[PDB]
């Protein structure tokens, strides 16, 4: 039993967007790191009925890439609208006491809100890895439009998880105008625009009770022209792709990184990228 374990987690609202040629810097590897787990949720449309059968390319490349540096992929859950993965390093695996479990929610009569909760033991401890995804407009059973439902939340659970992991399009935005909102960018005023966003709003509001978010540091991941670093502004500018952490049982996570990957433009979200030391 080591005394900690690291975690990477990438969300991407991808939307129609393909695998990328370079995996490594979508995960956090191209500087030679080696996490213990890393876990990839996507938010988009169509990933069930693949139509541009993508899906292969998906698994060959991610699969080349991982099996080679010691990964065994838990588990891969796909519904029309959300994708997440996870995979932790063979060494760890207990097949007696892994307890592999997944469970999905939906929201709506379509399957197209809700989430996906994949969740493993190592060492005795367990992790649970959510996604979420919610439309503006639905009726939901928060009557809030943020991506939270209770029985995502496995914190909440009379034998809650050790280490938790929240990733992905929390439908949390920026409450001002564009130009308010520009203009903050414009100066770097990334803790005064912050002050707009709605994560603290939903949280008055006893959703993502006691789930920490790592200190923001980059610009709004949304609404970019693709291929350009210029906001478009017909939508206020805001952090869509978020990740979240919290113990069950007091163990301490520490964020070592948390950015957007601003090499990625194909689209009008950036994806984002966290890191984490999880004590045992
Ligand atoms: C950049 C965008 C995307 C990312 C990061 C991504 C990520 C992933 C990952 C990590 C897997 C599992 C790979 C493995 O087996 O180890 C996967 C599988 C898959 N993805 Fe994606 N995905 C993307 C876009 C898409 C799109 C656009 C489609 C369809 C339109 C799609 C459909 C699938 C399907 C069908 C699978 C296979 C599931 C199975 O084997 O049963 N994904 N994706």
């Not at 590897?29 to 390319?57: C, H, M, R, W, Y």
């Not at 063979?90 to 709506?108: F, R």
């Not at 948390?258 to 984490?276: C, I």
Request: aromatic letters at 10%; charged letters at 25%; hydrophobic letters at 30%.
């Amino acid at each position: 039993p080591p005394a900690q374990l690291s975690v990477h987690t990438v969300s991407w609202n991808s939307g129609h967007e393909r695998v990328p040629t370079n995996l490594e810097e979508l995960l956090g590897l191209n500087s030679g790191e080696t996490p213990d787990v890393i876990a990839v949720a996507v938010q988009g449309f169509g990933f069930q009925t693949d139509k541009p059968q993508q899906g292969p390319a998906c698994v060959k490349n991610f699969q080349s890439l991982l099996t080679s540096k010691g990964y065994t992929k838990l588990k891969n859950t796909i519904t029309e609208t959300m994708g997440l993965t996870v995979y932790c390093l063979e060494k760890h695996l207990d097949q007696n006491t892994l307890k592999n479990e997944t469970i999905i929610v939906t929201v709506d009569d379509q399957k197209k809100s809700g989430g996906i909760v994949t969740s493993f033991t190592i060492y005795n401890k367990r992790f649970s890895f959510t996604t979420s995804r919610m439309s503006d407009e639905d009726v939901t059973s928060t009557n809030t439009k943020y991506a939270y439902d209770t029985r995502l939340d496995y914190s909440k659970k009379d034998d809650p998880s050790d280490f938790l992991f929240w990733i992905g399009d929390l439908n949390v935005r920026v409450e001002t105008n564009a130009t308010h909102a520009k203009s903050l960018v414009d100066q770097n005023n990334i803790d005064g625009l912050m002050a707009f966003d709605q994560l603290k709003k939903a949280k008055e509001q006893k959703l993502f009770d006691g789930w920490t978010e790592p200190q923001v540091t980059f610009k709004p991941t949304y609404k970019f022209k693709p291929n350009t670093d210029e906001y478009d502004l017909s939508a206020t500018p805001s952090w869509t792709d978020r990740a979240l952490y919290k113990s069950g049982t007091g163990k301490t996570i520490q964020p070592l990184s948390y950015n957007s990957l601003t090499n990625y433009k194909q689209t009008e979200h950036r994806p984002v990228l966290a890191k984490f030391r999880v004590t045992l």
